[PDB]
């Protein structure tokens, strides 16, 4: 949380800097602003589509394994830190056996193999009372391809 | 020659710049209504700087292995030096990795701020006293190519403008290949997990069974 | 018709002189206060860029920059 | 700085300062001398 | 494309889809940079603003080799998964 | 300094207009235009000629007492030289409350005269204090020359030596101010006080850096 | 025209060719300021003359007395004759004032050329000091400068530049192998490939510190030891 807070403050300083820079320094001309076809093309794919795909990355690598371990009863201060799921394939493979294959199923169009972190269960998790994190990951993945 | 070029790109691409193949699909080098760091001058200046850095890296991310495996010494892969501590760290360093970074930051400040001040305010590093080096920090009009008794210390070139122009095309091409290589080193490292040299010495063995497609699963 | 980045180098200067002149944005409120209404007016007319000038180039630059700050405070 | 100080003198800024000092003074007074119901 | 799937129905379907869709633009059977369309789905030609310079005899530009093959890739994926879900594959 | 072509802070960047080069140790360094006002310059110059001078004396002490404590000579380190028992006096024993009050009282008198002359030049030189006049005058802002403040007569002597001496004072004072932040920051990270920190760095120079001290670099 | 340091280079103007050994080698433009060129030259000459004496001592001492390692010969016990275990502080005292006089006198010849030329104690006894850094007279007894001193100066600077480079070799190849200048030549000629800088640069062979008569003196290898 502390690291995130610091990052948000850094972003804040970038935003105000950008506002001053794009006003007192590099101020866009009207012809730039009136390219609606470009704005929509970049806000739909680059902003919404990539924004969801980037989240479908976190949800699949950090939120899903951590939440599974938390719901399994594991103490929060004993769960492997997020990065270990990315680097140590064994840990992620144990939680989701489909990481034993790799990205091969995706390119081979055998997406089905990934039916342990991308599912259409529907309903609510019986342990935490909230939508399955697996279903949310699949949603953001789909929503992305659509926007892109 | 021209690669994926368009009439619009040619309007602002007339061949002068070293290594101009008219390849500007998005069109960022268009001078008309430009500013900030997207000004054509800064873009070309950065490309040269990237080429020089990439060429040093491209030759540095494979040399510890090509030499270390041969038995010269060291024998580390570019990710196991301390750049990315989670992926490994070398043990025999005369100082702390962060301590080295502290010196690195101070050194780059006196080397990349002086370089910059010579672009913003051309030939401004030759007036303020700098241990007498200032004289060698004058540079020429072109920001990318300084010159002087230091940067061009062996006056390579100067025998005709044609030789300078060929030596500048050699660099922009030996550097666009090095830039594509550095990206290759990182990408292969992430997927395979091994070093550039071992990745080559594996394609050479069973090429069909040792490629990106097979590396998707293996 | 070409979609390209178009920018004007260093248009507005960065100074506090305008900061010390409340109402510099409106021709009417630049003449200073004579009634206590001006106080409430300089606030009820500070974000109405369209009222400040007729140029749609400036009004847009102001809107685009404003959004930035909003993001910053968010 | 002459014009920055002019801005820091405008009513909204001066009032923000004066009040903050007055508020902090009362807060600090109760912080060291709490529950001041009577002048004793 | 991995694990030497080459030859697999999936490989054949994807290759066929990508090719059938690139030969639907190089052969003027669909909209392309230049020769666009209309409110009645008829190619009424088009002026591109960048003026892409293509060496291809028909004028097929890189923009059009990355815009028809992508359609083939989406079509192939839809067909592969569809037949896969059914008994067809 | 003391020149139109004086060495500057960021070689290349032009110097501020208010910073002409006359002021001692002028290197045209005012990025946030803090001294844009001429009156502000005079006040800021005086303030610097006040913080640096005290800082210089303070640095001389933290170094002399420290050198003593390292050689063995009974000397409490700067950090613990306040809890040290106050010495007695022929008049009586010292009390912390009285000590603070006396220190402020005396300072108020001197500060008043100094600031009053700063606001009204020559105001103190009115023979009001026991007839002392010119000695209470100020040669320059932050330069109260006389036969009580410059006894040897560096200011009254060669101006070139005086000017050179003025540069020495500014540069040394700025260094002392930076040094003082060190003495404090090295203490609030190492907990040892200088001359022990110089001794540790000269015994294992490579493994005794700021990076390896726990507080400086948190992760490392 | 003089032959320059590289077949493609052009001499810096300030290096017109007056100074001996002018091969136009100033890549960092350090000698651009005429005051600095003057000073740096005197430093070159002093460094050369000191290294030529040094490279002769290391080689010579080894040839004659071979038991004492050049690196370890400044130790009081290592000192020969009665000098063995002589108070180093008292020795420093002599080496101090005596060196201070000769150096300061030489420095005043830089500050005011041809000013400190006459014997301060006695009188009349003076040194020609035709060029700064070339006093001659008592300094040139057998009288060889009377000929083409410039040609001799060129040989002197060129020999000195080789020596300066050679003495820093003796220093490194000694803190790596642990053996003297000619012993490292012998080892190479015994097994060339196996006695190279490859099998010797990975070890800093030489004490980390030396206690001299109660004064510990820390020591270091130029390259960080592997
Ligand atoms: C002007 C700068 C200045 C600085 C940087 C320090 C710094 C310090 N003083 Mg200190 N002092 C300074 C001025 C003065 N002190 C004192 C009187 C004392 C005492 C009596 C003591 C310290 C102590 C200390 C140390 C512990 C602080 C503490 O526990 O709070 C207590 C702080 C104070 C009582 C005064 C701090 C003033 C600032 C600390 C390093 C303590 C010490 O020795 O640490 C072991 C301690 O007991 N100072 C006086 C006279 C009244 C000062 C000036 O006139
Ligand atoms: C940091 C240095 C700086 C300086 C010296 C200036 C100076 C100037 N700016 Mg400017 N600006 C800056 C930064 C700066 N700006 C940044 C970072 C942005 C991006 C947001 C902008 C965006 C901007 C726009 C869009 C405009 C100016 C304009 C101006 C000129 C007159 C208006 C003015 O600023 O008066 C002083 C104004 C204020 C003091 C208002 C402060 C508003 C700030 C941005 C945030 C306040 C929000 C507040 C916290 C909301 C919550 C309140 C609640 C807690 C009660 C003036 C010369 C105007 C102009 O060009 O002249 C016509 C103009 O339209 N600026
Ligand atoms: C993939 C391309 C892309 C992306 C991702 C975006 C994204 C965004 N645009 Mg945008 N835009 C684009 C292309 C793109 N744009 C093009 C090509 C044009 C010209 C036709 C425009 C013209 C345009 C205008 C006029 C405006 C936006 C605005 C916005 C923001 C919406 C406000 C918001 O919800 O804040 C949410 C904040 C976030 C989601 C955090 C992300 C913020 C990052 C830093 C923005 C970076 C976008 C930029 C393209 C990246 C390059 C920056 C680099 C040069 C340093 C949003 C973050 C609005 C805005 O500026 O709001 C302040 C707005 O006024 N855009
Ligand atoms: C809605 C947000 C937004 C938008 C629409 C723009 C738009 C623009 N900016 Mg800008 N900028 C923004 C935010 C934004 N900026 C912020 C927050 C900062 C502070 C860091 C800056 C700082 C900045 C500078 C210094 C400059 C610009 C410039 C430009 C113009 C050309 C460069 C460009 O963006 O083209 C396309 C993008 C590029 C050419 C390079 C992209 C580099 C980005 C930073 C990499 C990643 C971007 C992406 C959003 C990251 C996604 C997340 C990541 C983990 C994948 C252009 C019109 C340039 C200009 O003024 O032109 C005259 C310029 O000099 N911007
Ligand atoms: C150009 C980058 C570079 C860098 C950063 C290093 C760095 C290093 N090398 Mg090395 N080396 C390099 C290039 C480089 N080398 C090249 C191109 C060669 C082929 C001639 C060698 C051949 C080499 C050998 C044979 C050895 C090292 C060794 C070492 C390590 C100790 C160096 C030392 O103290 O002895 C002095 C420096 C060197 C011997 C070579 C470095 C000189 C380079 C060119 C620039 C300095 C060190 C971390 C030693 C080692 O492996 O430690 C056990 C060792 O035995 N290097
Ligand atoms: C040989 C050709 C072929 C075959 C046999 C199939 C067969 C199938 N497809 Mg498919 N598809 C194909 C080509 C093919 N497809 C191509 C070329 C594309 C690219 C455009 C797609 C894109 C596609 C998508 C996006 C989806 C399918 C889905 C499906 C399955 C259920 C369809 C359904 O009833 O949706 C449902 C019918 C409805 C009325 C519900 C939709 C209503 C919402 C609100 C709109 C089914 C087994 C669906 C699926 O995967 O099911 C698991 C689905 O998500 N296909
Ligand atoms: C401390 C020794 C020393 C000093 C003071 C000088 C001084 C000078 N040399 Mg010189 N030189 C030296 C050693 C030295 N040299 C050696 C050993 C060689 C043999 C390679 C040469 C070969 C040489 C040539 C060919 C020429 C000069 C020239 C000059 C003059 C040019 C002005 C200049 O750039 O000055 C600055 C020089 C210095 C301040 C010397 C200090 C060295 C710098 C600060 C760092 C060097 C570190 C070095 C690489 C370490 C080597 C280690 C290695 C031996 C293992 C100048 C007065 C030019 C000339 O003759 O003009 C009349 C010229 O043509 N020198
Ligand atoms: C808080 C300090 C802000 C900077 C300051 O006060 O001076 C800031 C000084 C003076 O600040 C203003 O400057 C403007 C002109 O550039 C105004 O018109 C006035 O001259 C002045 O008040 O200017 C700067 O150096 C810019 C600093 C930006 C931060
Ligand atoms: C033309 C165009 C036009 C249109 O319009 C648009 C567009 C498209 C955008 C454009 C394009 C662009 C591009 C292509 C780009 C690319 C880039 C890159 C890749 C870079 C690299 C880059 C890369 C680089 C620099 C590199 C670097 C590196 C370095 C320094 C170093 C490293 C290393 C080594 C030695 C070894 C050690 O042990 C470690 C380290 C230290 C780690
Ligand atoms: C010119 C130039 C120009 C540009 O600008 C830049 C540049 C390039 C940088 C430059 C260069 C420079 C250089 C090269 C330098 C070098 C130096 C040296 C090496 C010295 C040595 C040096 C060296 C030396 C002195 C030596 C010394 C020694 C001695 C005394 C002695 C010793 C010894 C002996 C006898 C024996 C005994 O038992 C012991 C002892 C005692 C121990
Ligand atoms: C005959 C001819 C030629 C050839 C050319 C070519 C080679 C073409 C091809 C081209 C191509 C090569 C095409 C393809 C394309 C494709 C692509 C570019 C892809 C895309 C992708 C996308 C669009 C996305 C997808 C997705 C994902 C990723 C996720 C999930 C969902 C989906 C599936 C949707 C040449 C010149 C040689 C010679 C002369 C004539």
The full 3-state SS of B119-182, as one line of letters, equals HHCCCCCCCCCCCCHHHHHCCCCCCCCCCHHHHCCCCCCCCCHHHHHHHHHHHHHHHHHHHHHH
What is the phi/psi pair of residue G87, to 5°?
-50, 115
Cα D14 to Cα D27: distance, rounded to the nearest angstrom: 20
**Count, residues in chain F:** 220
The answer to whether the Cβ–Cβ distance between A32 and C6 falls below 8 Å is yes
The answer to whether the Cβ–Cβ distance between A108 and E3 falls below 8 Å is yes
Cα B10 to Cα B21: distance, rounded to the nearest angstrom: 10
Q: Which value, in Å, is the radius of gyration of the alpha carbons in chain E?
A: 16
Contact criterion met (CB below 8 Å) for A84 and B86: no
Cα A45 to Cα A48: distance, rounded to the nearest angstrom: 6
Q: What are the residue ranges of helices labelled H in chain A?
A: 2-20, 30-33, 36-41, 50-58, 64-71, 82-87, 89-95, 104-107, 133-147
Question: Which residue of chain B comes nearest to A27, CA vs CA?
Answer: B35
Cα G153 to Cα G159: distance, rounded to the nearest angstrom: 10
Pocket lining: B179 vs ligand 9, CB cutoff 6 Å: yes
Q: CA angle, B216 as apex, B178 and A86 as ends, to 5°?
A: 90
Measured on CA atoms in the order C51, C6, B112, B138, is the torsion positive or negative? negative
DSSP G65: -
> What SS3 state is found at G215?
strand
- Residues 6 or more apart from F133 whose CB is under 8 A from it? F125, F126, F127
Cα E74 to Cα E67: distance, rounded to the nearest angstrom: 11
Cα G18 to Cα G150: distance, rounded to the nearest angstrom: 9
Note which residues in 171-190 of chain B have CB less than 8 A from chain G: none
Contact criterion met (CB below 8 Å) for F108 and F99: no
Choose among G140, G162, G182, G163: nearest CA to G54: G163
Pocket lining: E54 vs ligand 11, CB cutoff 6 Å: no
Cα A128 to Cα C61: distance, rounded to the nearest angstrom: 47
Choose among E25, E15, E29, E31: nearest CA to E56: E25
Cα G76 to Cα B173: distance, rounded to the nearest angstrom: 63
Contact flag for A and D (3+ C-beta pairs < 8 Å): no
Chain F residues closer than 8 Å to D1 by CB: 33-37, 40
Least distant ligand from the CA of A44: 3
- Residues 6 or more apart from A3 whose CB is under 8 A from it? none
From the CA of C4, how many Å to the nearest CA of chain B?
A: 7
From the CA of C12, how many Å to the nearest CA of chain B?
A: 14
For helices E9-22 and E62-85, angle between their N-to-C axes, nearest 10 degrees:
140
Cα(G52) to centroid(ligand 5), Å: 30
CB A133: neighbour CB atoms within 10 A?
A: 19
Cα B61 to Cα B196: distance, rounded to the nearest angstrom: 8
Choose among F184, F196, F187, F179: nearest CA to F55: F179
Q: CA angle, F82 as apex, F77 and F85 as ends, to 5°?
A: 105
DSSP symbols for G71-117: TT-SSTTTS-GGGTT--HHHHHHHHHHHHHHHHHHHHHHHHSTTTTT
Choose among A104, A120, A117, A131: nearest CA to A62: A117
Q: Which helix (H) or strand (E) holds C65?
A: helix C56-73
Q: Which residues pair with G217 in a beta bridge?
A: G210
Q: Residue E77, class by beta-carbon neighbours within 10 Å (0-12 exposed, 13-18 middle, 19+ buried)?
A: middle
How far from D36 is each of D2, D24, D25, F161, CA to CA, in Å? 43, 16, 14, 64
Choose among B139, B159, B157: nearest CA to B148: B139
Cα G182 to Cα G188: distance, rounded to the nearest angstrom: 10
F interface test, pick of B85, B102, B130 with most F CB neighbours within 10 Å: B102
Q: Is C47 left (phi over 0), alpha (psi -120 to 50) or beta?
A: alpha
Task: Please choose from G27, G31, G154 the residue to mutate so as to test ligand 7's pocket, defined by most ligand atoms within 8 A of CB.
Answer: G31
Pocket lining: B44 vs ligand 9, CB cutoff 6 Å: no
Cα G104 to Cα G99: distance, rounded to the nearest angstrom: 8
Q: How many CB pairs under 8 A join C and D?
A: 17
Cα B148 to Cα B151: distance, rounded to the nearest angstrom: 6
Contact criterion met (CB below 8 Å) for B213 and E1: yes
Cα E43 to Cα E22: distance, rounded to the nearest angstrom: 17
- Residues 6 or more apart from E45 whose CB is under 8 A from it? E34, E35, E36
Cα(A28) to centroid(ligand 4), Å: 12
What is the phi/psi pair of residue G97, to 5°?
-50, -45
Q: Is G31 left (phi over 0), alpha (psi -120 to 50) or beta?
A: alpha
Neighbours of D, requiring at least 3 CB pairs below 8 Å, are C, F
DSSP symbols for G116-133: TTB-SSSSS-B----BTT
Contact criterion met (CB below 8 Å) for A112 and A9: no
DSSP B87: G
Choose among G13, G20, G5, G16: nearest CA to B135: G13
Cα C71 to Cα E72: distance, rounded to the nearest angstrom: 40
Q: How many CB pairs under 8 A join A and C?
A: 67
Contact criterion met (CB below 8 Å) for A134 and A118: yes
Neighbours of E, requiring at least 3 CB pairs below 8 Å, are A, B, C
For helices A50-58 and A133-147, angle between their N-to-C axes, nearest 10 degrees:
160
HEC-encoded secondary structure of chain F: CCCCCCCCCCCCCCCCCCCCCCCCCCCCCCCCCCCCCHHHHHHHHHHHHHHHHHHHHHHHHHHHHHHHHHHCCCCCCHHHCCCCCCCCCCCCCCCHHHHHHHHHHHHHHHHHHHHHHHHCCCCCCCCCCCCCCHHHCCCECCECCCCCCCCCCCCCCCHHHHHHHHHHHHHHHHHHHHHHHHHHHHHHHHCCCCCCHHHHHHHCCCCCCCCCCCCCCCCC
B interface test, pick of G7, G29, G208 with most B CB neighbours within 10 Å: G29
Count how many Cα atoms sit within 13 Å of the Cα of residue E69 in the half-sphere of its side chain.
Answer: 8
Cα G215 to Cα A118: distance, rounded to the nearest angstrom: 73
Q: What are the residue ranges of helices labelled H in chain G?
A: 34-64, 88-111, 149-177, 181-190
Provide the resolution (angstroms). 2.8
> What SS3 state is found at G217?
strand
Q: Which value, in Å, is the radius of gyration of the alpha carbons in chain C?
A: 15
Contact criterion met (CB below 8 Å) for G135 and G128: yes
Pocket lining: A18 vs ligand 3, CB cutoff 6 Å: no
Residue with CA closest to ligand 7 atom 36: G30
Cα A95 to Cα A117: distance, rounded to the nearest angstrom: 9
DSSP B113: H
Cα E11 to Cα F84: distance, rounded to the nearest angstrom: 86
Contact criterion met (CB below 8 Å) for A117 and A128: no
DSSP A45: I
Cα F40 to Cα F22: distance, rounded to the nearest angstrom: 16
Contact criterion met (CB below 8 Å) for F26 and F1: yes
Neighbours of A, requiring at least 3 CB pairs below 8 Å, are B, C, E
For helices B196-203 and B161-192, angle between their N-to-C axes, nearest 10 degrees:
80
Contact flag for G and C (3+ C-beta pairs < 8 Å): no
Chain E residues closer than 8 Å to A111 by CB: 81
What is the phi/psi pair of residue E2, to 5°?
-170, 170
**E53-69 exposure pattern, b = at least 16 Cβ within 10 A, e = fewer:** ebeeeeebbebbeebbb
C interface test, pick of B27, B32, B35 with most C CB neighbours within 10 Å: B35
């Amino acid at each position: 949380l502390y690291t995130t807070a610091i990052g948000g403050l850094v972003m804040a300083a970038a935003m105000f800097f950008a506002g001053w820079f794009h006003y007192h320094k590099a101020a866009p001309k009207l012809e730039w602003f009136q390219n609606v076809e470009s704005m929509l093309n970049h806000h739909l794919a680059g902003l919404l589509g990539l924004g969801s795909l980037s989240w479908a990355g976190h949800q699949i690598h950090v939120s899903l394994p951590v939440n599974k371990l938390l719901d399994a009863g594991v103490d929060p201060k004993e769960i492997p830190l997020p990065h270990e799921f990315l680097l140590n394939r064994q840990i992620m493979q144990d939680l989701y056996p489909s990481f034993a294959k790799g990205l091969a199923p995706f390119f081979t169009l055998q997406w089905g193999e990934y039916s342990d972190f991308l599912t259409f269960n529907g309903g609510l998790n019986p342990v935490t009372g909230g939508l399955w994190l697996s279903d949310t990951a699949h949603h953001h993945l789909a929503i992305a391809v659509l926007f892109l | 020659q021209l690669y994926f070029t368009s009439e619009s790109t040619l309007q602002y691409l007339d061949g002068t710049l070293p290594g101009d193949f008219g390849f500007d699909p998005l069109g960022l080098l268009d001078p008309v209504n430009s500013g900030g760091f997207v000004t054509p001058q800064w873009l070309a200046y950065s490309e040269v700087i990237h080429c020089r850095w990439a060429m040093l890296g491209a030759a540095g991310c494979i040399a510890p292995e090509i030499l270390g495996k041969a038995g010269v010494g060291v024998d580390i892969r570019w990710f196991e030096t301390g750049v990315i501590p989670p992926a490994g760290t070398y043990d025999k360093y005369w100082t702390d990795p962060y301590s080295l970074f502290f010196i690195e930051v101070i050194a780059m400040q006196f080397a990349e701020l002086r370089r910059w001040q010579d672009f913003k305010y051309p030939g401004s590093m030759s007036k303020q006293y700098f241990v007498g080096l200032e004289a060698v920090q004058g540079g020429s009009g072109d920001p990318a190519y300084p010159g002087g008794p230091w940067f061009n210390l062996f006056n390579l070139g100067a025998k005709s403008e044609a030789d300078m122009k060929k030596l500048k095309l050699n660099e922009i091409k030996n550097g666009r290949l090095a830039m594509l290589a550095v990206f290759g080193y990182g990408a292969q490292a992430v997927l395979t997990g091994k070093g550039p040299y071992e990745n080559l010495l594996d394609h050479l063995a069973d090429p069909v069974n040792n490629n990106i497609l097979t590396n998707f699963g293996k | 018709k070409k979609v390209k980045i178009a920018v004007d180098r260093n248009p507005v200067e960065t100074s506090f002189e305008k900061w010390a002149k409340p109402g510099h944005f409106s021709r009417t409120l630049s003449k200073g206060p004579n009634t206590t209404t001006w106080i409430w007016n300089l606030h009820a007319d500070a974000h109405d860029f369209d009222s400040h000038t007729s140029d749609l180039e400036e009004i847009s630059r102001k809107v685009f920059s404003a959004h930035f700050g909003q993001l910053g405070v968010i | 700085m002459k014009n920055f100080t002019t801005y820091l003198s405008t009513a909204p800024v001066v009032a923000l300062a004066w009040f903050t000092v007055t508020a902090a003074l009362l807060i600090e007074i109760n912080r060291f001398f709490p529950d001041p119901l009577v002048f004793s | 494309r991995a694990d030497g799937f080459i030859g697999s129905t999936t490989n054949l379907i994807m290759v066929a889809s990508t090719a059938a869709f690139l030969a639907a633009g190089k052969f003027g059977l669909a909209p392309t940079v230049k020769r666009g369309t209309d409110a009645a789905c008829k190619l009424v030609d088009r002026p591109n603003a960048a003026g892409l310079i293509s060496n291809d005899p028909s004028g097929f530009t890189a923009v059009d080799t990355l815009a028809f093959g992508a359609l083939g890739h989406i079509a192939g994926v839809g067909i592969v998964l569809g037949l896969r879900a059914t008994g067809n594959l | 300094a003391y020149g139109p072509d004086r060495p500057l802070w960021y070689p290349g960047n032009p110097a501020p207009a208010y910073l002409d080069g006359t002021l001692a140790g002028d290197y045209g360094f005012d990025p946030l235009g803090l001294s844009s006002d001429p009156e502000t310059m005079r006040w800021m110059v005086h303030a610097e000629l006040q913080n640096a001078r005290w800082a210089m004396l303070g640095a001389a002490g933290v170094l002399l007492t420290s050198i003593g404590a390292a050689v063995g000579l009974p000397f409490p380190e700067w950090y613990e030289a306040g809890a040290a028992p106050l010495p007695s006096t022929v008049h009586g024993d010292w009390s912390f409350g009285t000590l603070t009050a006396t220190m402020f009282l005396l300072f108020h008198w001197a500060e008043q005269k100094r600031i009053m002359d700063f606001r009204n030049p020559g105001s103190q030189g009115d023979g009001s204090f026991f007839g002392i006049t010119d000695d209470f005058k100020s040669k320059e802002n932050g330069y109260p020359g006389g036969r009580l403040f410059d006894p040897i007569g560096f200011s009254r002597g060669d101006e070139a030596m005086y000017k050179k001496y003025k540069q020495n004072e500014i540069v040394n004072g700025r260094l002392a101010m930076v040094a003082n932040l060190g003495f404090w920051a090295q203490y609030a990270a190492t907990g040892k006080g200088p001359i022990q920190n110089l001794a540790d760095h000269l015994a294992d120079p490579y493994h005794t850096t700021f990076t390896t001290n726990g507080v400086s670099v948190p992760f490392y | 025209d003089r032959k320059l340091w590289a077949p493609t280079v052009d001499s810096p103007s300030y290096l017109n060719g007056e100074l001996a050994g002018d091969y136009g080698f100033d890549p960092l433009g350090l000698g651009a300021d005429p005051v600095a060129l003057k000073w740096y030259r005197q430093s070159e000459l002093v460094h050369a003359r000191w290294a030529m004496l040094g490279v002769a001592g290391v080689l010579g001492q080894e040839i004659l007395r071979p038991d004492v390692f050049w690196y370890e010969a400044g130790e009081p016990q290592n000192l020969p004759g009665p000098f063995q275990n002589i108070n180093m502080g008292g020795l420093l005292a002599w080496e101090f004032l005596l060196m201070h006089w000769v150096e300061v006198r030489r420095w005043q010849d830089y500050k005011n050329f041809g000013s400190v030329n006459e014997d301060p104690i006695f009188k009349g006894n003076k040194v020609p000091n035709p060029e700064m850094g070339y006093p001659g007279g008592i300094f040139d007894p057998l009288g060889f400068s009377k000929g083409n001193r410039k040609e001799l100066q060129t040989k002197e600077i060129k020999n000195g530049r080789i020596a300066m480079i050679a003495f820093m070799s003796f220093v490194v190849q000694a803190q790596a192998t642990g053996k003297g200048p000619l012993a490292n030549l012998a080892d190479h000629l015994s097994n060339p490939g196996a006695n190279n800088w490859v099998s010797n640069i990975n070890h800093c062979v030489t004490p980390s510190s030396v206690d001299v008569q109660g004064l510990t003196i820390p020591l270091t290898c130029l390259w960080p030891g592997s």
